[PDB]
Amino acid sequence: GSLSRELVFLILQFLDEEKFKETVHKLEQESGFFFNMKYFEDEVHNGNWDEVEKYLSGFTKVDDNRYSMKIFFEIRKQKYLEALDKHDRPKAVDILVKDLKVFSTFNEELFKEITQLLTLENFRENEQLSKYGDTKSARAIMLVELKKLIEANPLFRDKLQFPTLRNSRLRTLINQSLN
């Protein structure tokens, strides 16, 4: 019930058909009207953490609510574990201070336990993390958690469904009227 919002959905369908894919996602992000779950899934799967966070930023901030807090924490925790698994402690300690320290103030003992992982030979020595397989398996299990959190978050609840539109909607509307 907003022309600005109706136009965004019409434009998003034109861009998709035109295959201007980067523009599709920038419009979703910058407008905030539609969160593409299919896009987010692919991005999490390919470990493109910078784009995952930039995209999320168009819909939520890290401290907006408890769901938003856990979404960002889960992603940074995975980014961290992956640096540990590749035996890159300088990178893992860089992620801990720059990305995970923000949540230390909330659960302090959790942060201490996550920090302790840097000293283990293999982080699977920790009871909770013994079940972590490879990075492909880990990303899949976290994505299932991420998906639950987005669906249960009030800031995202009304932004997961794209309207049912006839193909070339914007093409057919401008052609008839611009005459």
PDB file of C-alpha atoms in Angstrom:
ATOM      1  CA  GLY A   1       0.000   0.000   0.000  1.00  0.00           C
ATOM      2  CA  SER A   2       2.977   2.344  -0.799  1.00  0.00           C
ATOM      3  CA  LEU A   3       3.899   3.412  -4.404  1.00  0.00           C
ATOM      4  CA  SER A   4       7.591   3.662  -3.393  1.00  0.00           C
ATOM      5  CA  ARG A   5       7.395  -0.006  -2.154  1.00  0.00           C
ATOM      6  CA  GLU A   6       5.366  -1.139  -5.249  1.00  0.00           C
ATOM      7  CA  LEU A   7       8.028   0.427  -7.533  1.00  0.00           C
ATOM      8  CA  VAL A   8      10.921  -1.345  -5.706  1.00  0.00           C
ATOM      9  CA  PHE A   9       9.271  -4.779  -6.334  1.00  0.00           C
ATOM     10  CA  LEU A  10       8.551  -3.903 -10.012  1.00  0.00           C
ATOM     11  CA  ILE A  11      12.199  -2.680 -10.470  1.00  0.00           C
ATOM     12  CA  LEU A  12      13.611  -5.782  -8.627  1.00  0.00           C
ATOM     13  CA  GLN A  13      11.751  -8.075 -11.176  1.00  0.00           C
ATOM     14  CA  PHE A  14      13.034  -5.980 -14.204  1.00  0.00           C
ATOM     15  CA  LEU A  15      16.685  -6.142 -12.873  1.00  0.00           C
ATOM     16  CA  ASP A  16      16.401  -9.930 -12.302  1.00  0.00           C
ATOM     17  CA  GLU A  17      15.078 -10.499 -15.870  1.00  0.00           C
ATOM     18  CA  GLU A  18      17.846  -8.129 -17.172  1.00  0.00           C
ATOM     19  CA  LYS A  19      20.335 -10.273 -15.125  1.00  0.00           C
ATOM     20  CA  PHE A  20      21.666  -7.136 -13.227  1.00  0.00           C
ATOM     21  CA  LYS A  21      22.154  -9.440 -10.158  1.00  0.00           C
ATOM     22  CA  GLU A  22      24.452  -7.167  -8.065  1.00  0.00           C
ATOM     23  CA  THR A  23      21.829  -4.371  -8.476  1.00  0.00           C
ATOM     24  CA  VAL A  24      19.053  -6.787  -7.370  1.00  0.00           C
ATOM     25  CA  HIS A  25      20.758  -7.334  -3.985  1.00  0.00           C
ATOM     26  CA  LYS A  26      21.892  -3.687  -3.537  1.00  0.00           C
ATOM     27  CA  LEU A  27      18.235  -2.576  -4.054  1.00  0.00           C
ATOM     28  CA  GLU A  28      17.030  -5.240  -1.530  1.00  0.00           C
ATOM     29  CA  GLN A  29      19.666  -4.028   0.936  1.00  0.00           C
ATOM     30  CA  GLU A  30      19.278  -0.217   0.446  1.00  0.00           C
ATOM     31  CA  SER A  31      15.423  -0.196   0.239  1.00  0.00           C
ATOM     32  CA  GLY A  32      14.972  -2.783   3.020  1.00  0.00           C
ATOM     33  CA  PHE A  33      11.661  -4.067   1.594  1.00  0.00           C
ATOM     34  CA  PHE A  34      12.735  -7.612   0.675  1.00  0.00           C
ATOM     35  CA  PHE A  35      15.260  -9.984   2.305  1.00  0.00           C
ATOM     36  CA  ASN A  36      16.266 -12.594  -0.265  1.00  0.00           C
ATOM     37  CA  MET A  37      16.724 -15.826   1.790  1.00  0.00           C
ATOM     38  CA  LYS A  38      17.963 -17.684  -1.359  1.00  0.00           C
ATOM     39  CA  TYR A  39      20.741 -15.035  -1.803  1.00  0.00           C
ATOM     40  CA  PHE A  40      21.748 -15.061   1.934  1.00  0.00           C
ATOM     41  CA  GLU A  41      21.995 -18.965   1.815  1.00  0.00           C
ATOM     42  CA  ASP A  42      24.369 -18.871  -1.224  1.00  0.00           C
ATOM     43  CA  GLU A  43      26.488 -16.128   0.397  1.00  0.00           C
ATOM     44  CA  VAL A  44      26.792 -18.051   3.732  1.00  0.00           C
ATOM     45  CA  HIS A  45      27.604 -21.266   1.732  1.00  0.00           C
ATOM     46  CA  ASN A  46      30.450 -19.542  -0.190  1.00  0.00           C
ATOM     47  CA  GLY A  47      31.869 -18.009   2.980  1.00  0.00           C
ATOM     48  CA  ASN A  48      31.493 -14.410   1.618  1.00  0.00           C
ATOM     49  CA  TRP A  49      31.283 -12.974   5.218  1.00  0.00           C
ATOM     50  CA  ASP A  50      31.813  -9.324   4.181  1.00  0.00           C
ATOM     51  CA  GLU A  51      28.824  -9.419   1.772  1.00  0.00           C
ATOM     52  CA  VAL A  52      26.708 -11.416   4.306  1.00  0.00           C
ATOM     53  CA  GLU A  53      27.238  -8.582   6.899  1.00  0.00           C
ATOM     54  CA  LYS A  54      26.812  -5.683   4.355  1.00  0.00           C
ATOM     55  CA  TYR A  55      23.507  -7.237   3.151  1.00  0.00           C
ATOM     56  CA  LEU A  56      22.252  -7.779   6.722  1.00  0.00           C
ATOM     57  CA  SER A  57      23.064  -4.119   7.527  1.00  0.00           C
ATOM     58  CA  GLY A  58      20.243  -2.964   5.203  1.00  0.00           C
ATOM     59  CA  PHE A  59      17.749  -4.741   7.518  1.00  0.00           C
ATOM     60  CA  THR A  60      19.341  -4.829  10.989  1.00  0.00           C
ATOM     61  CA  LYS A  61      22.185  -3.517  13.193  1.00  0.00           C
ATOM     62  CA  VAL A  62      24.214  -5.947  15.468  1.00  0.00           C
ATOM     63  CA  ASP A  63      22.562  -4.507  18.682  1.00  0.00           C
ATOM     64  CA  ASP A  64      18.966  -3.968  17.393  1.00  0.00           C
ATOM     65  CA  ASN A  65      17.731  -7.079  19.327  1.00  0.00           C
ATOM     66  CA  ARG A  66      18.744 -10.546  20.752  1.00  0.00           C
ATOM     67  CA  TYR A  67      18.063 -12.376  17.424  1.00  0.00           C
ATOM     68  CA  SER A  68      20.224  -9.828  15.514  1.00  0.00           C
ATOM     69  CA  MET A  69      22.956 -10.221  18.186  1.00  0.00           C
ATOM     70  CA  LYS A  70      22.997 -14.092  17.763  1.00  0.00           C
ATOM     71  CA  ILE A  71      22.898 -13.840  13.871  1.00  0.00           C
ATOM     72  CA  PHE A  72      26.131 -11.736  13.821  1.00  0.00           C
ATOM     73  CA  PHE A  73      27.748 -13.790  16.678  1.00  0.00           C
ATOM     74  CA  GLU A  74      27.130 -17.107  14.877  1.00  0.00           C
ATOM     75  CA  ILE A  75      28.686 -15.788  11.611  1.00  0.00           C
ATOM     76  CA  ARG A  76      31.813 -14.320  13.360  1.00  0.00           C
ATOM     77  CA  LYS A  77      32.191 -17.492  15.500  1.00  0.00           C
ATOM     78  CA  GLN A  78      32.209 -19.548  12.163  1.00  0.00           C
ATOM     79  CA  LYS A  79      34.680 -17.041  10.559  1.00  0.00           C
ATOM     80  CA  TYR A  80      36.902 -17.567  13.725  1.00  0.00           C
ATOM     81  CA  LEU A  81      36.699 -21.432  13.859  1.00  0.00           C
ATOM     82  CA  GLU A  82      37.591 -21.508  10.136  1.00  0.00           C
ATOM     83  CA  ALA A  83      40.787 -19.442  10.754  1.00  0.00           C
ATOM     84  CA  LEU A  84      41.689 -21.931  13.590  1.00  0.00           C
ATOM     85  CA  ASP A  85      41.028 -24.975  11.330  1.00  0.00           C
ATOM     86  CA  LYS A  86      43.429 -23.478   8.659  1.00  0.00           C
ATOM     87  CA  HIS A  87      45.962 -23.113  11.558  1.00  0.00           C
ATOM     88  CA  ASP A  88      45.989 -19.296  11.157  1.00  0.00           C
ATOM     89  CA  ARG A  89      46.106 -18.076  14.820  1.00  0.00           C
ATOM     90  CA  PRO A  90      47.233 -14.504  13.768  1.00  0.00           C
ATOM     91  CA  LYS A  91      43.965 -14.243  11.696  1.00  0.00           C
ATOM     92  CA  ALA A  92      41.830 -16.041  14.373  1.00  0.00           C
ATOM     93  CA  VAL A  93      43.108 -13.629  17.114  1.00  0.00           C
ATOM     94  CA  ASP A  94      42.396 -10.635  14.694  1.00  0.00           C
ATOM     95  CA  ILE A  95      38.697 -11.832  14.302  1.00  0.00           C
ATOM     96  CA  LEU A  96      38.377 -12.399  18.090  1.00  0.00           C
ATOM     97  CA  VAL A  97      39.367  -8.734  18.911  1.00  0.00           C
ATOM     98  CA  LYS A  98      37.771  -6.945  15.901  1.00  0.00           C
ATOM     99  CA  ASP A  99      34.611  -9.018  15.471  1.00  0.00           C
ATOM    100  CA  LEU A 100      33.778 -11.057  18.642  1.00  0.00           C
ATOM    101  CA  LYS A 101      34.952  -8.661  21.406  1.00  0.00           C
ATOM    102  CA  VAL A 102      31.714  -6.592  20.919  1.00  0.00           C
ATOM    103  CA  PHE A 103      29.692  -9.512  22.476  1.00  0.00           C
ATOM    104  CA  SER A 104      32.172 -10.031  25.407  1.00  0.00           C
ATOM    105  CA  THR A 105      30.285  -7.436  27.570  1.00  0.00           C
ATOM    106  CA  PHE A 106      27.107  -9.611  27.210  1.00  0.00           C
ATOM    107  CA  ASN A 107      28.361 -13.181  28.004  1.00  0.00           C
ATOM    108  CA  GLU A 108      31.876 -12.756  29.512  1.00  0.00           C
ATOM    109  CA  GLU A 109      32.566 -16.451  30.291  1.00  0.00           C
ATOM    110  CA  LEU A 110      31.525 -17.387  26.716  1.00  0.00           C
ATOM    111  CA  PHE A 111      34.117 -14.940  25.283  1.00  0.00           C
ATOM    112  CA  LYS A 112      36.747 -16.416  27.676  1.00  0.00           C
ATOM    113  CA  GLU A 113      35.942 -19.963  26.477  1.00  0.00           C
ATOM    114  CA  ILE A 114      36.008 -18.886  22.760  1.00  0.00           C
ATOM    115  CA  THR A 115      39.405 -17.172  23.434  1.00  0.00           C
ATOM    116  CA  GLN A 116      40.689 -20.448  25.043  1.00  0.00           C
ATOM    117  CA  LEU A 117      40.209 -22.246  21.668  1.00  0.00           C
ATOM    118  CA  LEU A 118      43.311 -20.400  20.280  1.00  0.00           C
ATOM    119  CA  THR A 119      45.538 -22.454  22.611  1.00  0.00           C
ATOM    120  CA  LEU A 120      44.100 -25.964  21.718  1.00  0.00           C
ATOM    121  CA  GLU A 121      45.881 -28.139  19.064  1.00  0.00           C
ATOM    122  CA  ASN A 122      42.421 -28.862  17.495  1.00  0.00           C
ATOM    123  CA  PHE A 123      39.277 -26.953  18.728  1.00  0.00           C
ATOM    124  CA  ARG A 124      37.305 -30.253  18.471  1.00  0.00           C
ATOM    125  CA  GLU A 125      39.076 -31.052  21.852  1.00  0.00           C
ATOM    126  CA  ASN A 126      36.299 -28.865  23.382  1.00  0.00           C
ATOM    127  CA  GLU A 127      33.151 -30.970  24.280  1.00  0.00           C
ATOM    128  CA  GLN A 128      30.573 -28.699  22.514  1.00  0.00           C
ATOM    129  CA  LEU A 129      32.775 -28.449  19.362  1.00  0.00           C
ATOM    130  CA  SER A 130      33.685 -32.200  19.180  1.00  0.00           C
ATOM    131  CA  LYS A 131      30.713 -32.695  16.745  1.00  0.00           C
ATOM    132  CA  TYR A 132      32.119 -30.031  14.222  1.00  0.00           C
ATOM    133  CA  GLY A 133      33.050 -31.886  11.011  1.00  0.00           C
ATOM    134  CA  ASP A 134      34.512 -29.894   8.083  1.00  0.00           C
ATOM    135  CA  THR A 135      33.757 -26.287   7.026  1.00  0.00           C
ATOM    136  CA  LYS A 136      31.041 -27.407   4.483  1.00  0.00           C
ATOM    137  CA  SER A 137      29.209 -29.396   7.237  1.00  0.00           C
ATOM    138  CA  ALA A 138      29.657 -26.546   9.777  1.00  0.00           C
ATOM    139  CA  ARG A 139      28.317 -23.852   7.383  1.00  0.00           C
ATOM    140  CA  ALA A 140      25.194 -26.003   6.660  1.00  0.00           C
ATOM    141  CA  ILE A 141      24.392 -26.547  10.374  1.00  0.00           C
ATOM    142  CA  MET A 142      24.895 -22.815  11.185  1.00  0.00           C
ATOM    143  CA  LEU A 143      22.749 -21.778   8.145  1.00  0.00           C
ATOM    144  CA  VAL A 144      19.831 -23.860   9.567  1.00  0.00           C
ATOM    145  CA  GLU A 145      20.323 -21.924  12.877  1.00  0.00           C
ATOM    146  CA  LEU A 146      20.606 -18.566  10.975  1.00  0.00           C
ATOM    147  CA  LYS A 147      17.413 -19.238   8.953  1.00  0.00           C
ATOM    148  CA  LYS A 148      15.435 -19.915  12.240  1.00  0.00           C
ATOM    149  CA  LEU A 149      16.763 -16.649  13.753  1.00  0.00           C
ATOM    150  CA  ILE A 150      15.871 -14.464  10.708  1.00  0.00           C
ATOM    151  CA  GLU A 151      12.308 -15.968  10.551  1.00  0.00           C
ATOM    152  CA  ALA A 152      11.763 -15.322  14.331  1.00  0.00           C
ATOM    153  CA  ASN A 153      13.195 -11.734  14.231  1.00  0.00           C
ATOM    154  CA  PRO A 154      10.544  -8.923  14.231  1.00  0.00           C
ATOM    155  CA  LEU A 155      12.674  -6.720  11.879  1.00  0.00           C
ATOM    156  CA  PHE A 156      12.557  -9.472   9.154  1.00  0.00           C
ATOM    157  CA  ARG A 157       9.088 -11.134   9.620  1.00  0.00           C
ATOM    158  CA  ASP A 158       7.265  -8.881   7.052  1.00  0.00           C
ATOM    159  CA  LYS A 159      10.161  -8.884   4.474  1.00  0.00           C
ATOM    160  CA  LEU A 160      10.503 -12.628   3.464  1.00  0.00           C
ATOM    161  CA  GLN A 161       7.793 -12.860   0.772  1.00  0.00           C
ATOM    162  CA  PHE A 162       8.116 -11.423  -2.756  1.00  0.00           C
ATOM    163  CA  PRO A 163       4.751 -10.472  -4.392  1.00  0.00           C
ATOM    164  CA  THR A 164       3.241 -12.681  -7.120  1.00  0.00           C
ATOM    165  CA  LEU A 165       3.692 -10.642 -10.297  1.00  0.00           C
ATOM    166  CA  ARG A 166       3.206 -11.303 -13.994  1.00  0.00           C
ATOM    167  CA  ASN A 167       6.484 -11.392 -15.977  1.00  0.00           C
ATOM    168  CA  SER A 168       7.826  -8.103 -17.492  1.00  0.00           C
ATOM    169  CA  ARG A 169       5.380  -6.100 -15.250  1.00  0.00           C
ATOM    170  CA  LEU A 170       7.365  -2.849 -15.424  1.00  0.00           C
ATOM    171  CA  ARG A 171       8.023  -3.268 -19.217  1.00  0.00           C
ATOM    172  CA  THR A 172       4.252  -3.700 -19.934  1.00  0.00           C
ATOM    173  CA  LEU A 173       3.272  -0.747 -17.620  1.00  0.00           C
ATOM    174  CA  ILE A 174       5.689   1.889 -19.016  1.00  0.00           C
ATOM    175  CA  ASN A 175       5.210   0.891 -22.696  1.00  0.00           C
ATOM    176  CA  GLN A 176       1.379   1.455 -22.591  1.00  0.00           C
ATOM    177  CA  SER A 177       1.491   4.821 -20.677  1.00  0.00           C
ATOM    178  CA  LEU A 178       4.617   6.562 -22.183  1.00  0.00           C
ATOM    179  CA  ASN A 179       2.601   6.765 -25.523  1.00  0.00           C
TER     180      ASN A 179
END
